[PDB]
Amino acid sequence: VTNGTSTANKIVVQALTRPGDIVLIDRNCHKSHHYGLVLAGAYPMYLDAYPLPQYAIYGAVPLRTIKQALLDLEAAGQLHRVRMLLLTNCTFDGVVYNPRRVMEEVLAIKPDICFLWDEAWYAFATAVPWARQRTAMIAAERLEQMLSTAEYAEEYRNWCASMDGVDRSEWVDHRLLPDPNRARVRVYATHSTHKSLSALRQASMIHVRDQDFKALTRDAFGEAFLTHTSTSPNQQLLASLDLARRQVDIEGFELVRHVYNMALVFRHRVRKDRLISKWFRILDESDLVPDAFRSSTVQVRQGALADWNEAWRSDQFVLDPTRLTLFIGATGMNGYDFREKILMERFGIQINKTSINSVLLIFTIGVTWSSVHYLLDVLRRVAIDLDRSQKAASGADLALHRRHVEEITQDLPHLPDFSEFDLAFRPDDASSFGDMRSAFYAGYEEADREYVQIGLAGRRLAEGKTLVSTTFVVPYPPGFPVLVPGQLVSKEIIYFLAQLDVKEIHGYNPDLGLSVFTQAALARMEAARNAVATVGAA
Amino acid sequence: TRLDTWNLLDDACRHLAEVDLAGLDTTHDVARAKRLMDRIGAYERYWLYPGAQNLATFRAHLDSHSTVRLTEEVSLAVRLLSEYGDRTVLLADDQFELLVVASIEDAITAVIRHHDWVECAEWIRELRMDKAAVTWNANQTYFVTNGTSTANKIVVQALTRPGDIVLIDRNCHKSHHYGLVLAGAYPMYLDAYPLPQYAIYGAVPLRTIKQALLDLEAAGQLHRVRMLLLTNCTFDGVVYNPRRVMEEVLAIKPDICFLWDEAWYAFATAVPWARQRTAMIAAERLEQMLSTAEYAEEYRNWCASMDGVDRSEWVDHRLLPDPNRARVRVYATHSTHKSLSALRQASMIHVRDQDFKALTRDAFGEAFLTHTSTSPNSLDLARRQVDIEGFELVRHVYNMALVFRHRVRKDRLISKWFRILDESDLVPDAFRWNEAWRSDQFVLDPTRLTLFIGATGMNGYDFREKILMERFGIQINKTSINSVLLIFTIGVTWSSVHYLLDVLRRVAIDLDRSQKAASGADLALHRRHVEEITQDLPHLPDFSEFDLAFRPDDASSFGDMRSAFYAGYEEADREYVQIGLAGRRLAEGKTLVSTTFVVPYPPGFPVLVPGQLVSKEIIYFLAQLDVKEIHGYNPDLGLSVFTQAALARMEAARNAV
Amino acid sequence: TYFVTNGTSTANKIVVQALTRPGDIVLIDRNCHKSHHYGLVLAGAYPMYLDAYPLPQYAIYGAVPLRTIKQALLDLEAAGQLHRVRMLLLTNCTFDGVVYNPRRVMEEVLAIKPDICFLWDEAWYAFATAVPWARQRTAMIAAERLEQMLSTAEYAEEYRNWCASMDGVDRSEWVDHRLLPDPNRARVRVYATHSTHKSLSALRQASMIHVRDQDFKALTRDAFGEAFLTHTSTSPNQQLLASLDLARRQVDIEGFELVRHVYNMALVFRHRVRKDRLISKWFRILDESDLVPDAFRSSTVSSYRQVRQGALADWNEAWRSDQFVLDPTRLTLFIGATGMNGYDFREKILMERFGIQINKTSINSVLLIFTIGVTWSSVHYLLDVLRRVAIDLDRSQKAASGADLALHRRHVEEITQDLPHLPDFSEFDLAFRPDDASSFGDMRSAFYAGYEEADREYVQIGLAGRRLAEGKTLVSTTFVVPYPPGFPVLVPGQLVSKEIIYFLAQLDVKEIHGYNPDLGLSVFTQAALARMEAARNAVATVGAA
């Protein structure tokens, strides 16, 4: 695909989904994903990541949640609709999903679902040993091999005997194995081939591993590929290019490996340097993955080959070695300020994300031993000056410093979990998926929209006149849509929104208000939906 | 997993307390919690902290709603199980704690001490740039981008010129033999002392070097000799003492150049005694030594006795270099640590040469052009080395190699059938701590460990393939008739060491069980298997003289290896003879001469070289060698040997002048 | 195709060792990069040096005319030595930017020597994938077209009629005829070694040895693999490198966009440097009318009256049929009108490293190499530099009225109107020619014999002329590689003919490779040459006694 990664997602989504399907999409995923779901009419069921309040960031979505949501739709009898599980193989923070488990257990419930993995962030997995396993195409290969073996058929027989007499509603409490006969591995993935940012930022690939592609989806996939990218004489790229055993890049193997050994050297120095480690720390699976999701329990940098391998094989969540979250909370300085002033000169490492008390270091092919040594120099200078100003501290300066540390460490604000869709837009009132497309288009009716000040919105909730957002809201710090068309603005989301002083939030403006539905418009839309749900059923 | 069901029960009890404080119907969360305890209790009896008694007490608490009690107790229990487990080393019963269990051996999953007990052993317990160039040296450096073969070729071309004789270790690296082919120098092959017990070569004893120099002296070809080429820290791991060899050799030829291939001695830096052994430190000490007037007096005192004996008898004396004529022109090469990467780009050429500038600088810069791109040379090669030094991987793997051999010795199970050959075995007595590494010719590098396996009765290829099917990282790269060579490298990790120790323990267990099962003749057969490889082996084949077609003079042993190599390209002049026919053809009295190098998978050492006569011992060795991955020999087409017509032609042609 | 991790000269050494053994003659374009000559020292083959057609008005060397190659083969054929000839090493897309027509070169060479191997250094011809008609002049496409042609029956009939046309012509006169390779004997054994795009960048990493060899699987597979491991490593993953990547390596699709962008930037630069009248007043970009003598092309601009602008592709037949054409991404810029020397201009006026390059500075010209980093910004920057130079030259012309017109005329005439001779290859000394009639040299023996510190002596360049007139002939012991030519003007054992000493005497640069004005030109002592000639005579006797 000669266009940016979001075009590959558009292609596969349009090739697999039809309007009125349910797509289980993680809410943390970038706004471009949700906009694509608005297109094609798909109804998203939002899956909510486990929170990390102490960093005010989100992790992955536990497989527990994915199973529970699928089972919940199964109890509603709606499950037949479910056509996709859109996840991101590597989270922006770095949390790497273990795909083989996320697909075994999901295919236990829905034997014919399609998986889409956005792997744009998991770029260097081919350098890191034991990382390629957690990709979508290697997970799909291993799962397809497993499903073919007779030994697996015996394992599944014994597993069914183990679950025999367990109520299907209780499947969330037990691991699941995908029935070999019904389970159909239909995995997809998308990434960027080292695309140049700002200019010619078009590099992308669609990796397809789909047993039914040739029968059910070849035509739709080709048509979507032409629709998204304009038809041209050079149509070879869409149909029959099949470059699975092509585009060998031995030099690119040496470049990804140079960048991985660069990340290793940085991560080692930042820990062993006695100045830096006094104030700085790099977060680890012990810090960024709650231990409920890591069966393995009690040096990784030195050696660690064949001991820490198990964590990659069996854990739910691990850190990508190149997505280094630098904790700065002990510096008593907020991430936005630290990035803005200390790191203003910038360098090959992107440092493109800033949480309240941490900054995310993203190594890229533009790295060298001099970018590593520059960043380490910067860190060491900050450490030296913090030591100086700590030694100069009076008791009042000690109170100042310690509270500057406390305010970014102890009482951090609650992370707004997804509120359920408004009734006017849930097609089935028993289930939490929503007609987010119709809420998107219904939001442009300038007579149905209304503006309410954030301060007013809490009062309105107390009054009982429910608030429903007409539009996406995508604040910069989390970098994903906290609100979507037709989502109820629950009290916690109002309280979260109220703290942000950035006027420039996407989809919202504090000088103007929340773009919410008028009450009469909501009543009318609810009545219309109930009329449709009547005429459509009797 | 146990910890996963315990975390699910912790969740269930937390939500039980949530609902109870909310006042909704807890019967759903009560039912979930009861099912969770029922599932957990099927196996929780096999652990210590949250034993079946604590399950029973949580159940008792559960029957009464008691939500507050269990949303604290269960979460505290799971926090302890996560953070500590049974510490809150675990024993079993048919700092310490004792899992008293009637159902012994079910609780192998608990982790352990403790009717054959064979099954228990299997499950558990019985099993298992100015900043970067300041340190290593300051005198000289010359980074080579194509690896250590290329550094060898660069230095060879810089020094040796066509018509020069070089003394070269018979089993040095193939790149050396090819460098001599390329330069057109005549090798005189110094032959290393054998270990017939093990079918490995050790090293060239200094007496052989002095003998070759004095043979050249009698011949009158000594002036021709140009350089001495020896592989310090040979693949077997025997280590040359450079100071003694350089000191004695400079007595006979005060202007010979030394090239030390140290590419296998990567861990000299790791340990200080090894650092003394390095060629550069010996060159420094020798150069300082020669300046001192105290040494001038020592030399005068030595010469005042040595003028009573002839030069031909110097082989038995301890010689000393004449400080008025000795010129220390020593060189060295050191491969850097590269893991895969398809480059092997890094290399080094150290140079401590008093006359380099005057004579070899021009030809050294040209050798660089011929084999390398001079203009880029090399900061990249050096900057990462200081970071690897910052890691201290060499010190780490040296430490874990010592711990490995300690465990292999101390442990009674492994020691029964395995051992690590030491200086007592690999260094014959005739050549035999901080001072000892200074005081004798040969020592062993601790990181290149020969595992003796003779008690197993399996040859090294069979052992490697049968046992070490998967080697996480031990870099085993050689197999002998009764031993295998473990090359510790920066890559190897602690879990690779523990994997290898586990495999050794398991093989010891299998051999122990087989010994118990075996009786009479079958047991005798195992004894025979150990006896046949260990007790008797054919002696390593001696290097045979270069053919008279190639020896520039018939008195001396050096030969025109270049002409033999390139003359072997004429297909009409050299047939291929199968080695089973070779012995019969030799019995017919036809000569046999090899046209090609014969280099097996074990790096470097060529069995045959161009123009060397085939001899019965070499035929036997070639037949016996297990591995068939050999360069320059074809297992089915046979051995490429010169025609008698070609040999007669070249003999007659060289006879003229 | 095989991926060599260690640059282009490594690939050349690999193929030379795979194909040549000591004492084989190789025909080699003399002006090729010095690293090619050291490879022939190492391989022990004898070079027969082919000398390019001179362009003295630019002090540039062109390609080797194909008639030179036919004559050089038929010289050895008359000597009876031709059996030795093993290779024809030529550099496609020579640094100056002249581009060979490999198809015709192979056809006519295989007419004379039906089993020769060809090596093409294509490291300069990187952007031929962009240019719409340049691909056909790559060695690996010319070899495909030639192998197809050699297969057809129609070609067998054409050759029958061609040999009937030549019937009764002496083999010595085939230099004057257009030949065709006998489809029964000629065998396409072409090799090409091109640098990677990463290597094109100043850091040099990686290369590819393209192979189109009929007799690889039989005659050369083993030697090729052996030499591959000899020149890289004998370690795991070298074998993986030894694996082919011909139907693989489609990742260049992203690469193709970049090479086409670079080509479009080159076209834009050429059109804006020709149209813009400030720049065009002084600056010019040499074309096939300037850098290729008319004798080597049939396309003549003036002869066809219905002329076209030529920015557009109205000259597609030149690529197909001419001997020599210019790579459009290697643009020579003529600064003769300005009056500044090329080195002075490059070093002072621009110092442009943002995109493009000036690897070579000619006496009156500077070569512009469009690399993969060029962007619209880079070409507009370079054009702005040219424009400012033109404006200040116009200013100096206005001021030039007051007695400085003669200084401007003097500078211009001195650099462009007046030119020095370009020294063509002399001949090897008798001491180092194995056959006294032929011209190929035992250059390896001269290279090693040159290290005998008792056989070398130094002579000052001021004395060399009188030494030569005295009959005390001069023979160089080493390479000499002056910076401006960029190739060895002397090699071990080459006679320093009067024109070559006259060339060296002009150079101000003291740091020339292989030579030092403060010591002298290293030459063989007379007694050493006499001894070497006597040794050669002894060899020529015992080889026939």
Side-chain angles (χ1 to χ4, degrees), chain C residues 5 35 65 78 102 195 208 222 247 305 316 325 355 376 436 485 506 519 527 530 542:
Chain C
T5 55
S35 68
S195 162
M208 260 163 276
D222 296 348
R305 303 312 308 157
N316 304 337
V325 297
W376 302 95
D436 70 344
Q506 314 310 323
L519 291 145
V542 176

Side-chain angles (χ1 to χ4, degrees), chain B residues 345-543:
Chain B
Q345 180 199 335
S347 182
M348 282 167 333
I349 301 171
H350 307 161
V351 180
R352 188 50 165 278
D353 170 2
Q354 293 187 329
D355 295 313
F356 169 79
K357 250 196 169 177
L359 312 178
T360 301
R361 192 218 61 205
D362 272 340
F364 191 92
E366 290 198 345
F368 248 84
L369 289 163
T370 302
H371 307 138
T372 300
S373 300
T374 316
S375 295
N377 174 47
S378 81
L379 282 74
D380 294 280
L381 296 173
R383 297 198 60 186
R384 68 204 193 203
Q385 282 167 14
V386 50
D387 311 322
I388 300 163
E389 199 73 69
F391 289 45
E392 329 208 78
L393 293 173
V394 305
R395 185 170 174 255
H396 182 271
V397 306
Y398 175 105
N399 284 1
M400 77 213 300
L402 294 190
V403 174
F404 171 75
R405 77 180 298 150
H406 179 282
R407 295 293 185 247
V408 171
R409 178 176 57 50
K410 167 257 287 176
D411 180 25
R412 70 191 177 82
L413 251 168
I414 313 168
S415 71
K416 285 280 186 58
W417 324 88
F418 298 112
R419 38 190 293 255
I420 305 295
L421 300 181
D422 59 327
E423 300 167 33
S424 186
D425 281 288
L426 261 56
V427 184
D429 313 326
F431 315 114
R432 296 299 308 290
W433 173 275
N434 303 286
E435 168 66 342
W437 271 56
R438 155 152 61 261
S439 299
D440 58 8
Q441 290 194 50
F442 305 128
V443 301
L444 268 60
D445 185 41
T447 68
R448 303 184 73 89
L449 297 180
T450 303
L451 182 74
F452 181 83
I453 67 169
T456 71
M458 276 163 329
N459 43 331
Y461 182 109
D462 292 351
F463 176 90
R464 176 160 76 186
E465 301 255 21
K466 294 165 70 175
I467 300 316
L468 301 147
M469 310 155 269
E470 61 266 60
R471 298 151 220 130
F472 289 91
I474 322 98
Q475 194 55 324
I476 182 165
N477 46 14
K478 184 165 172 176
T479 56
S480 306
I481 195 60
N482 64 28
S483 59
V484 302
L485 176 55
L486 314 174
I487 304 306
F488 277 75
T489 59
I490 56 160
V492 310
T493 83
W494 274 113
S495 37
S496 314
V497 177
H498 292 194
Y499 148 93
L500 183 57
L501 290 170
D502 163 49
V503 171
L504 265 51
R505 287 171 181 286
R506 280 194 278 143
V507 179
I509 272 168
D510 298 344
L511 264 284
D512 188 72
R513 290 168 188 161
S514 294
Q515 173 180 320
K516 178 182 174 183
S519 182
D522 70 350
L523 185 71
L525 182 59
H526 179 254
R527 299 300 110 79
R528 206 262 189 208
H529 295 333
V530 47
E531 287 250 14
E532 182 55 45
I533 57 182
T534 312
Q535 302 299 132
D536 175 61
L537 293 166
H539 284 356
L540 294 170
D542 230 355
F543 171 77

Side-chain angles (χ1 to χ4, degrees), chain C residues 124-138 259 327 329:
Chain C
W124 309 132
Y125 201 44
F127 302 94
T129 295
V131 179
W133 300 105
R135 188 168 188 78
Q136 78 194 309
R137 288 187 170 246
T138 62
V259 85
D327 184 60
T329 69

